[PDB]
Each structure stands twice: as C-alpha cells, then as structure tokens.
Design a binder for this molecule. Sequence first.
Ligand SMILES: Cc1cc2nc3c(=O)[nH]c(=O)nc-3n(C[C@H](O)[C@H](O)[C@H](O)COP(=O)(O)O)c2cc1C
Ligand SMILES: Cc1cc2nc3c(=O)[nH]c(=O)nc-3n(C[C@H](O)[C@H](O)[C@H](O)COP(=O)(O)O)c2cc1C
Lengths: 171, 171
Amino acid sequence: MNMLVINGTPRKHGRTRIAASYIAALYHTDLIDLSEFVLPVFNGEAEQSELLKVQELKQRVTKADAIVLLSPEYHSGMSGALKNALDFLSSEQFKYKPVALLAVAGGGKGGINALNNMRTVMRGVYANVIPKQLVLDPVHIDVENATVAENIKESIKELVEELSMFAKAGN
Amino acid sequence: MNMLVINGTPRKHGRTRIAASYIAALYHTDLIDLSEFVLPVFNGEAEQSELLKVQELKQRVTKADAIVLLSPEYHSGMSGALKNALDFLSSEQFKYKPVALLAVAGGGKGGINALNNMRTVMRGVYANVIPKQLVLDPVHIDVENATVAENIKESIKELVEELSMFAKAGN
Ligand SMILES: Cc1cc2nc3c(=O)[nH]c(=O)nc-3n(C[C@H](O)[C@H](O)[C@H](O)COP(=O)(O)O)c2cc1C
Ligand SMILES: Cc1cc2nc3c(=O)[nH]c(=O)nc-3n(C[C@H](O)[C@H](O)[C@H](O)COP(=O)(O)O)c2cc1C
C-alpha cells in the first residue's frame, strides 16, 4: 500500500498543514506539503519541465497507488497553489488512481465548492475519486496542539479506509 | 467606462493571449496578461502583500468598473496561474463588480467546467457575473494571423455589450 498525501495549502501556518501532517503520520505516507514544495507558476515552457522540482512531483505522484488530496477552500475553490501544481501533471500520472478528497474551510457552509472543484479536476485527469469526501472546519483542528480534534478522527479513518478499499480492489 | 481584461493563460504562446489581446485592443481596455504579469505562488505572508507586483494587481483590478475574465481550461478548471492571482484579492476589489467570463478550450465539449469554476469563484468574492458566457475553441482563433476568427467576433461583441449594459445600470 504505497499512499501519498498532498497538502494543498501554501501557507506554512495553515490549518490544512496540520490535517495533512496528522494523516501522513498516522498512515506512514509520502507527503507533499505545498508550503515547502514550492513550484513556479506554470508557463508551458518545456524548459520548466526540466525544473528541479517538477520532475520529482510527477515521480512521487505517479509512484503512489492512492492519494489523499487536501486543500483549503480559497474563494470557493481549491488553492491556486495546488491547481498550479496539478497543471504540471496529466492523466499520465493520475489515470485510474484512487483519490480521496478532503477540504479545509473556515466554517459555515464553506468547503463543498472546494471539493466539487477538485472532484471535477481530478475527473479531468481521469482519476478515480472515491465517494466519501470530507470537510474539516476550525472546530476540527486543534491548532494549539498541532493536531486534529477527536471529533473528526473517526471520519478520517473511514475516509482513508474507503480509499484503501478502492485502491486494493484496483488489482 | 473603465474596463479591464485579464488573460488567465500563463503561456505567452497561448491562444487565450490572442483572444484577450484582441478584445483589449478593440475596446481600449486595461490588460493584465498573466504571461508577463508573473506573481509568486501565494503563501499568506503579509510580506508578500508588499510585493512589487501584488499591489498593482489589487490597484488595477479595483480601478476597473467591469472585467472580462479569460482563461484556458486546464484539467477542466481555470488556470492555476489565474487562481493564484485571485487568491491575492478578495471581495474587497470585486464586490458587485460586473464580470464577463470567457474560456478557451481545445475543442470538443471542453470549456464549461472552466466557466463554472470561474463563475463559482467570482461569486465567492461577491462579483456580479453576467449571464452570457462564451467558450472559444481553436476554430475561433487564427493563430497565423494573431487575432480571432470572424465566426466568433459577433459573439464577443454581444458579450462585451451585455457587460457594458450591466456595468452601467450599476449606477
Ligand atoms: C484568500 C483566502 C480565501 C478564502 N476563502 C474561503 C472560502 O471561500 N470559504 C471558506 O470556508 N474559507 C475560506 N478561507 C479560509 C480558509 O478555508 C481557512 O483559513 C482554513 O483554516 C484553511 O487554512 P489554510 O489555508 O491556512 O490551511 C479563505 C482564506 C484565504 C486566505
Ligand atoms: C495542462 C493542460 C491541461 C488542459 N486541459 C484541458 C481541458 O481539460 N479541456 C480543454 O478543452 N482543453 C485543455 N487544454 C488545452 C487548452 O484549452 C488549449 O491549449 C487552448 O488552446 C488554450 O491554450 P492556452 O492555455 O495556451 O491559452 C489543456 C492544456 C494544458 C497545457
């Protein structure tokens, strides 16, 4: 079970980091934190494909057999940071690969548009997004303790468990 | 009538540039071409808000009284380049401002997801997206002549005309 987790939040001090950091640790996964893994804004130039960064991304993303894609909802969407990232990839690295969506909003009814966005894009690169999805609000993140609240743990378990299921049935 | 046009395509050799470049010229508008206007991937740091670039963006975007937002559909979405841009802004600069969406796909049924994406995000910053929207395929862009095909001109006229209408009724 070679799993990958991508923290779409560019902000190093962002809650999504905490969530992503919790999941990766609890499941011993690869982890691409867009706070550290900084890429340049895509520009189509193939001399950009030869960039330090970029080759590793395709490499790690294609290595994984299942992915947990996290991102904060920014202006009812996924982060520009994560979209830019994805623009470098294609259905080459994602085709038929299991993906679990998870968004980090700021409360209220925020978070679904971030999810539909991701879901649509993922389907754009032909991935296999599992049904169960999840949105984590601030009440689900314990900043002071740099980890997630108890109330949401069971949900994350079920998410990762449905991912694993699909990712296995694959073969 | 102070209008602004934003070419969401990062690629300098991209078709969206041609379209955006045509519209801006035909209507004497401001123009932010994301091929030249390169920003860094957002990161939340306020020391990024003091970046050369960033201050001008908010400035020009808030100056405009109507905006024609163009972008190519990348992985069924708007470009990471343009989303990143928008992440720097907020409902501060967009509230109630008229926006016309226009996407540049590669043919087939591509282009609507790019539009819904933008439409949702725009609504996120409280803008006033006009009803009429438009998708331009390759058959609508005359690359060799660095301009748009005749078949699509009337459509662009109607688009910009509905924008102006709304942008005026505003007051
Ligand atoms: C530019 C910007 C736009 C945002 N837009 C939304 C939004 O549309 N809906 C929402 O629920 N939260 C929004 N947020 C709040 C984030 O979802 C919230 O910060 C969350 O804790 C994720 O934080 P992170 O991006 O630092 O990980 C936005 C935050 C920023 C900085
Ligand atoms: C990473 C990437 C992803 C793309 N995804 C789509 C897509 O989902 N649907 C589509 O109709 N075209 C897609 N295209 C093609 C562009 O829409 C097409 O190039 C168009 O001419 C706009 O070109 P431009 O981005 O250079 O302006 C994609 C192109 C690239 C480079």
